[PDB]
Write a protein that binds this DNA or RNA. Structure first.
Ligand SMILES: [Mg+2]
Ligand SMILES: [Mg+2]
Ligand SMILES: [Mg+2]
Ligand SMILES: [Mg+2]
Ligand SMILES: [Mg+2]
Ligand SMILES: [Mg+2]
Ligand SMILES: [Zn+2]
Lengths: 124, 109, 126
RNA sequence: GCCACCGGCGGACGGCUCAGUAACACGUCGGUAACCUACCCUCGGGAGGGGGAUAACCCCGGGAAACUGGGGCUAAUCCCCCAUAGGCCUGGGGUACUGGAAGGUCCCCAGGCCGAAAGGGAGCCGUAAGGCUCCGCCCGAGGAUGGGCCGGCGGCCGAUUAGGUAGUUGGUGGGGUAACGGCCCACCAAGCCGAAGAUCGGUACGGGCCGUGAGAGCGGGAGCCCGGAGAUGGACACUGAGACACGGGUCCAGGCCCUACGGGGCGCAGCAGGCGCGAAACCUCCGCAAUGCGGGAAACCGCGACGGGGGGACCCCCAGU
């Protein structure tokens, strides 16, 4: 579809975002969390927005991402499906009590044409 | 001769089991009653009966009352039907046995 | 959902209608059937009041004993004639009367494994 | 000096109503040698070494809302490991203590399993070492406060309701529990209540007490105190010393509400206020000054508990025209 990538530089702790679509939104449509995709092949985006210093063999991997309505991606439920499970911690729940639980709606692991935001970081 | 806190005389034999106050590992503590046996059909258990008088207050007369309980019957003093027994109180032994026989008086008649 | 409260039937045979609900302080847990294996596993529980209970689940050694108070930690082979249950000696479930067959003879268990988390025995005579 | 966030303690008490319950639910006398217990009191002992994330804060957001994602940096009375003290089980052998009576306590051998802590914080004195005293942390023995469990006895109506029970009654060996117990299980038996009313129906929260009568008695147990039970009906678990939790969490059934139609929520038998039902029942008020509770080293802070008024031929006492 179209996505909103959140590129984050772990070596200096600043981030940027860009909007990709068309040919770009087909080469990461089926990728799972922690995949290490090369930047040059996918990325029409350039060595900018950060200061123009990166090498040429850099690549990023998938970390998380929300959904079309606003639900997070729980990196344990494999499959691009949407479920409603009872949580106690972890991505998808903010407890704010002791020993408490709740029934929150989360999304699977594989990217889909429903995901709108994708979170990535740059390993060199 | 061993006593258990009743100032009475022990039985003339020796037992086996541990649910006997005289020879085993049971402790007695509580009420101390006295009645006559009305059945010993099942194993190691009897049924003891005692009678008392209730005093009504409006009519000012009396009235005869009963009480049937169930007691463990150790193998050294095995009591039959129709004889006086002294029984004591202790912890729950089964669903409905909470007393134990300790001494037998007037066996036959 | 193993409720260990009262009964619902009087000693005379009439039924009882419960007047309250089940209190959390009356419940029970699952039988921890001890097996024979090549490595013993055990867990730890938190109990009423904050205490603990060590819970053996598989057995490897035996702690066999004697008449002069001389123990020896030796491993077990299999169970024979558990009088508790009719089909335990076959599946190798050790409860408390089990007749353990150590590698130095026979023995009789004298401890509760599911409560203490150890197996103890006396050297049964022939 | 102000503010939120990590961290500790409290929210299981207090307030409300009487639906269910003929029962060890309640009253009274006893039992636990068959049990748990944070805050608090006394005595006797310990605080020796290592390691680690992540809220606040900074850079990007997603979603209509409820809410929630990715990267960076940081600390503890936060979290985790090692050692030692200690806790638990079983075998063998001594006789030191309590008690009416030791499956308990104490001492000596042996085989195993579990396994602690924050020398942390604030004032002062001396150049500094370093003290002085205030609030603290962990283990053991005992109490106290609060309960769980178990007996003996005592209190309604019905025969146009006579037989009832099959884990039902008991024994042997076990599991489970904080703990005894057919409380559950595997085998062996045939017991157990009953015309002195069992079983099944009916109605009902129990007592201290209250109305009436010269008394014997007959009738009632809304309001105050003490016990029990419930949070729209039925099932079930997490955290904790304690709950299967009225203002905490799931599932079903039955109602209602917001929505950008994809998804979210709520349940006054707390205090005022509203609708419905009925012959039948009040202000959407002011305060933490008093009695007390939770927190804090303390001064203090919060409390529809409690305290002050507003409405009404509620019951008593003392007067006017
Ligand atoms: Mg409450
Ligand atoms: Mg009835
Ligand atoms: Mg973060
Ligand atoms: Mg038994
Ligand atoms: Mg009723
Ligand atoms: Mg009126
Ligand atoms: Zn005897």
């Amino acid at each position: 579809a179209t996505f909103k990538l959140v590129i984050s530089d772990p070596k200096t702790g600043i981030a940027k975002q860009i909007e990709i679509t068309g040919p770009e939104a087909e080469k990461l449509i089926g990728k799972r969390i922690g995949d290490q995709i090369p930047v040059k092949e996918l990325g029409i985006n350039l060595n900018e927005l950060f200061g123009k210093e990166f090498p040429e063999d850099v690549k990023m991997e998938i970390r998380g991402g929300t959904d079309k309505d606003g639900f997070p991606m729980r990196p344990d439920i494999h499959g691009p499906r949407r479920v409603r499970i009872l949580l106690s911690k972890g991505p998808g729940f903010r407890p704010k009590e002791k020993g408490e639980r709740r029934k929150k709606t989360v999304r699977g692991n594989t990217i889909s044409p429903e995901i709108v935001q994708v979170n990535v970081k740059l390993v060199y | 001769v061993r006593d258990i806190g009743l100032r009475i005389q022990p039985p003339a034999e020796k037992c086996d089991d541990p649910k006997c106050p005289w020879h085993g590992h049971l402790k007695i503590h509580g009420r101390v009653f006295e009645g006559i046996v009305v059945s010993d059909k099942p194993r190691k258990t009897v049924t003891v009966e005692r009678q008392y008088y209730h005093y009504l207050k409006k009519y000012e007369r009396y009235e005869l009352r009963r009480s049937r309980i169930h007691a463990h019957n150790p193998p050294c003093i095995n009591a039959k039907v129709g004889d006086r027994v002294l029984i004591a109180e202790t912890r729950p032994l089964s669903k409905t046995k909470h007393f134990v026989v300790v001494a037998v008086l007037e066996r036959a008649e | 959902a193993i409720w260990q409260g009262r009964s619902l039937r009087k000693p005379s045979g009439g039924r009882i209608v419960l007047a309250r609900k089940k209190r959390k302080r009356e419940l029970g847990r699952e039988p921890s059937n001890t097996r024979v294996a090549e490595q013993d596993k055990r867990k730890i529980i938190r109990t009423y009041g904050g205490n603990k209970k060590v819970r053996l689940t598989a057995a490897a050694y035996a702690n066999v004993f004697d008449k002069s108070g001389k123990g020896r930690k030796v491993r077990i082979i299999r169970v024979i004639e558990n009088p508790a249950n009719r089909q335990f000696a076959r599946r190798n479930i050790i409860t408390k009367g089990a007749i353990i067959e150590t590698e130095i003879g026979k023995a009789k268990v004298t401890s509760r494994p599911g409560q203490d988390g150890v197996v103890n025995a006396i050297l049964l005579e022939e």
